[PDB]
């Protein structure tokens, strides 16, 4: 069992599940091998239906497709069709919110309000839009109004990139025609282009799925914005995860997917629902999140996090989880199935997101707290059928210190420098106490044995004296083998990061350091980690590519994690992602993916699936970047 | 070579192309085959870095997705993105064509102009937009600025769907949810939904698959709305088809891809550079189409059709195509490596559409006569680069009487009851001089041999007296086969047809019968069909799903003939596609869109793959149709 996950809890259940009979996502994994290896080189198309289409990597033919596309382009399409959907992902949740934000404040949606007026008026500032005299509720519409105007074409071009990038890298992007018109603009383009028939060279196709990628930025930064605004900035906060955190006495209640527009609710119900679940032989109802609307969640409220991406059936198979309440994304629809199995209560709430077998009870931002009240009496009712029934949790958790928005940075850090807070940060990276920072951002996948690429490329980059970031399941993984609780800093970290993580977290009260991994939030939270590195690129008067900063996708999965990687290049970072995408099919492709997109925007694709060999090739890139800056390495 | 196509031309071509060693479409097919068996099944997903997945239509594992996504999932998800890749190309067309009568009007495009100012002020009407005491510039700001917010959400759905479906046939689809919010919303939203995680219920996703395919038709009738603004309304016109049409002794250009934006220009262009052409030693410029661009000014214009969809390669093959001007989809990028060849300057004008290997020259629609002249120039230097060089132009072409808008078809009819067009055609249609209707749409495909399924159903249902109507290359295949010849009227018609086809055109004065088939123009132009039946539906007091009418894509290929076929079916007709979409290795899904939608718009698709079945299937949905109407039959 451990070499399908390096998590001792999901080992357990494994188990658990192999001697019920229950089938898992690893199970099916084996069951699928081996796989096509078209697909995974990405010499297939089905594009239209002559096809479906393939090329042989090596050897005699096929060696075209039947309209004649090549190689290349087959790979560019697949890859900006996987971009343009993740870019419908997260621009579609941010498209959400603000639809609920503009409902909130003209009075259709009494269960949602301001919460950050601060955040609030610092995005209309940001955005143009003028607060003088104003009320809050008609800041608001117009923020909202000018969300969704980012969607389609205007006079202007999309402001959640144009104002949230520094100028020169605005300027490095428009000169390349990269900055885009309308976010689902964007996505029909790409579909029409990639489409046959239409765009068949390479370079095209790829600097149109850059532009998309920067579509798919705007709908994570609009996501972060919004949330803030509704739900409320993120700051320092404890909690635990990992599935010991689920109660046998409690009504289990897990948050998945992706949207805090539910999952919000959810949490400030189920403290008003406390009696009728004791009432149900209870002791309460313990909500627990799951994948990113979990870590929204734990951000704003110390919510704990059950467990994240390939093992979210592991929460089922303990037979403690009441209810899994749904919206989108990420969502194994195996879940439906175990349901039955386990006694869990599969519950979806999007009109646009079902799964066959799963209860569905729409949520309504009008309703909304009717309709979580009636989600959460289907778990209470559930609690009460397994009276009685043996339950086996593993008596596994850490701790996580999280809630470090950009806000929640600069803020620790002025505790150190009241008027500069980027400036102590700063000192530090010249004086090698950090060498730099690395960004952990995506999923797990079951291709690689669950966490073992972040852990292991997290331990080498600390003891380096790495300045470590993390979102997404990234964050669960980090989380879940102890790199957000403090305790770990001196096992974990190299002394230069030590003494900084130290420094500022005596400054801010609670007597030791930060922990050894800053957890910034869920995958549209990845636009935290852009601020942050935007305001050190104007603090230092230099663009984005010279700056010592790095991502990983260390165990990618889904279509929004390659988006992001794509953003990450496009913003100009060094950007690792640890499994395979569907280029190798084509060195032209590869190379411009991995080198020649450098001259284009400073940024690079690494793929590397070895993660010792990814840590050496992360560290050379962030020293690299020193060297750049004329600093020791 | 009659395996290959049934055209003559065709053959001829081959024959050059096989002893010239010029690999071809047909070719490429053939090094592909056997095609993947799971991808012709639909049982492939590789939407996650998990995959590829496939499941085995029959025996052992796998049998599901490595998330656990069924085979009806992964096939619903793969058909749902088919159709909103093609909705983002007939509506990226539309918006194209929107910005370019924005521009005209306020003064930046002055090669544009309101032509059809009569079909200007009935858009305006339709859509609620005040024309008296307004100047006609800024009434077509307005129609163009409406046009563009149907492609985002607003306080209306989709107008240029709500405003041409008639109210009843509206109430119908928004009690099943259907009508769309906004076009690139829709494609957004579809690519979001079937990303992973999301939306695993078939009978949903499909749902909003249809919904999406009413984004594709509301960009097909906006495009056509727009261009008749722009270039004016067809009207019956004779011209010629088949690479007859080309001429050795004047500088041959070939129009193809789909938007007159561009051809429009390069027609009148080109006649003003006439004596440029016979300084050059031509004659003079040829232009000819090729697929839907060259239907556009076929039926605008009477310019000869060269050949359509799989066989355009063939083109080149003559030695005698001097250019080919191309702006996006349906051009096999075969083309470019072609022309080195054959000769064959290859000019893209579309950033986001371009060949790697084709001259690129940027067509700019507020430059467009320079542009236009850049790039004639070029056609014409190439003729002068094959002087003395032999050529092989098969001497094979048809006369085509094409332009039938419904417009004109209307007004064809009136001359038989000017107050009451729509009735002669209802009262034959209850005598049963005409049995129904039938639309051919669509385009070739190299697994079924060129035109052998439209020309074996045309020929059975025209002996059945079904008044036949085609777009596309579906058209594209009947002109050249004859079907637009009056003089074919005796042997290919029925005696009722023949009779109703006689008196209309003898009272429209040209000594004889309408053709055989109405060509009713490009594939936006399919939306003209939609007008036509409901006028006839509302002249009735009826649905659609009540008329006897279907639909046939018959050699179906594209993407955009997926999305068109699953409108017709949406807004309520039996709809035949004559080659397998990847849909048989779910019967669930199969029996939702051959039976079960039935019951939510009346429609189904037939899927028949044996043209002589596919005819007899197409004449007992027409008669079950007449039957409910308590017609004879
Ligand atoms: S678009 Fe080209 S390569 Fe793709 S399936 Fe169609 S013929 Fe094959
Ligand atoms: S979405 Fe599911 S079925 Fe598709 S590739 Fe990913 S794991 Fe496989
Ligand atoms: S041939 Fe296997 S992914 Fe298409
Ligand atoms: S296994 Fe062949 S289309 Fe994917
Ligand atoms: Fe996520
Ligand atoms: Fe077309």
């Given at each position: 069992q451990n070499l399908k996950s390096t998590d001792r809890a999901v080992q357990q259940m494994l188990d658990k599940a192999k001697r019920e009979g229950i089938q898992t996502v690893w199970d099916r994994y084996e069951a699928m091998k081996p796989q096509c290896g078209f697909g995974e080189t990405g010499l297939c198309c089905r594009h239209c239906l002559q096809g479906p289409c393939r090329i042989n990597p090596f050897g005699d033919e096929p060696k075209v497709g039947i309209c004649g596309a090549t190689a290349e382009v087959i790979v560019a399409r697949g890859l900006d069709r996987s971009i343009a959907a993740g870019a419908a992902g997260h621009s579609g949740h941010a498209k959400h919110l603000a639809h609920t934000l503009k409902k909130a404040v003209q009075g259709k949606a009494a269960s949602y309000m301001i919460k950050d007026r601060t955040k609030l008026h610092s995005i209309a500032k940001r955005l143009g839009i003028p607060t003088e005299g104003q009320k809050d509720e008609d800041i608001a519409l117009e923020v909202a109004k000018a969300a969704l105007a980012d969607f389609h074409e205007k006079d202007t071009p999309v402001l959640w990139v144009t104002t949230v990038l520094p100028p020169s890298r605005v300027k490095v992007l428009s000169a390349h025609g990269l900055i885009p018109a309308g976010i689902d603009h964007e996505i029909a383009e790409i579909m029409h282009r990639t489409s046959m028939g239409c765009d068949a060279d390479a370079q095209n196709l790829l600097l149109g799925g850059l532009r998309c990628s920067?579509?798919?930025?705007?709908?994570?930064?609009?996501?972060?914005?919004?949330?803030?605004?509704?739900?409320?900035?993120?700051?320092?906060?404890?909690?635990?995860?990992?599935?010991?955190?689920?109660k046998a006495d409690a009504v289990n209640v897990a948050v998945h997917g992706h949207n805090p527009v539910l999952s919000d609710i959810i949490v400030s119900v189920s403290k008003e629902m406390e009696n009728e679940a004791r009432?149900?032989?209870?002791?309460?109802?313990?909500?627990?999140?799951?994948?990113?609307?979990?870590?929204?969640?734990?951000?704003?409220?110390?919510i704990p996090a059950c467990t994240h991406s390939v093992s979210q059936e592991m929460a089922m198979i303990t037979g403690a989880?009441?209810?899994?309440?749904?919206?989108?994304?990420?969502?194994?629809?195996?879940?439906?199935?175990?349901?039955?199995?386990?006694?869990?209560?599969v519950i979806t709430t999007m009109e646009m997101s079902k799964i066959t077998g799963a209860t569905h009870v729409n949520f309504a931002e009008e309703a909304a707290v009717e309709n979580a009240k009636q989600i959460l009496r289907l778990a209470i009712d559930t609690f009460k059928r397994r009276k009685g029934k043996p339950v086996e949790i593993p008596n596994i958790?850490?701790?996580?210190?999280?809630?470090?928005?950009?806000?929640?940075?600069?803020?620790?850090?002025?505790?150190?420098?009241?008027?500069?807070?980027?400036?102590?940060?700063?000192?530090?990276?010249?004086?090698?106490?950090?060498?730099?920072?690395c960004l952990f951002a995506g999923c797990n996948n079951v291709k690689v044995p669950q966490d073992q690429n972040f852990t292991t490329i997290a331990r080498k980059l600390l003891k380096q004296n790495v300045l470590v970031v993390a979102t997404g399941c990234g964050a669960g993984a980090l989380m879940r083998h102890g790199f957000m609780d403090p305790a770990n800093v001196d096992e974990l970290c190299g002394d230069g990061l030590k003494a900084?993580?130290?420094?500022?977290?005596?400054?801010?009260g609670l007597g030791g350091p930060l922990p050894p991994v800053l957890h910034m939030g869920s995958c549209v939270d990845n636009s935290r980690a852009v601020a942050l590195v935007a305001a050190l690129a104007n603090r230092l008067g230099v663009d984005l590519d010279?700056?010592?900063?790095?991502?990983?996708?260390?165990?990618?999965?889904?279509?929004?994690?390659?988006?992001?990687?794509?953003?990450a290049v496009t913003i100009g970072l060094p950007t690792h992602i640890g499994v395979l995408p569907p280029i190798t099919g084509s060195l032209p492709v590869t190379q411009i993916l991995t080198s020649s997109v450098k001259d284009i925007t400073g940024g690079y694709f690494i793929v590397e699936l070895d993660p010792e060999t990814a840590a050496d090739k992360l560290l050379a890139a962030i020293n690299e970047r020193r060297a750049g800056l004329g600093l020791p390495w």
């Open positions: 920067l579509a798919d930025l705007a709908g994570c930064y609009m996501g972060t914005d919004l949330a803030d605004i509704l739900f409320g900035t993120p700051a320092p906060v404890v909690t635990e995860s990992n599935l010991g955190v689920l009432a149900a032989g209870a002791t309460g109802i313990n909500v627990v999140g799951i994948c990113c609307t979990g870590n929204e969640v734990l951000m704003r409220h110390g989880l009441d209810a899994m309440i749904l919206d989108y994304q990420c969502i194994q629809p195996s879940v439906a199935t175990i349901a039955e199995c386990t006694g869990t209560t958790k850490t701790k996580v210190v999280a809630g470090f928005s950009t806000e929640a940075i600069i803020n620790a850090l002025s505790k150190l420098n009241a008027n500069d807070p980027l400036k102590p940060l700063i000192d530090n990276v010249v004086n090698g106490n950090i060498r730099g920072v900084v993580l130290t420094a500022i977290g005596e400054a801010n010279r700056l010592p900063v790095v991502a990983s996708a260390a165990e990618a999965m889904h279509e929004k994690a390659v988006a992001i990687g794509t953003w």
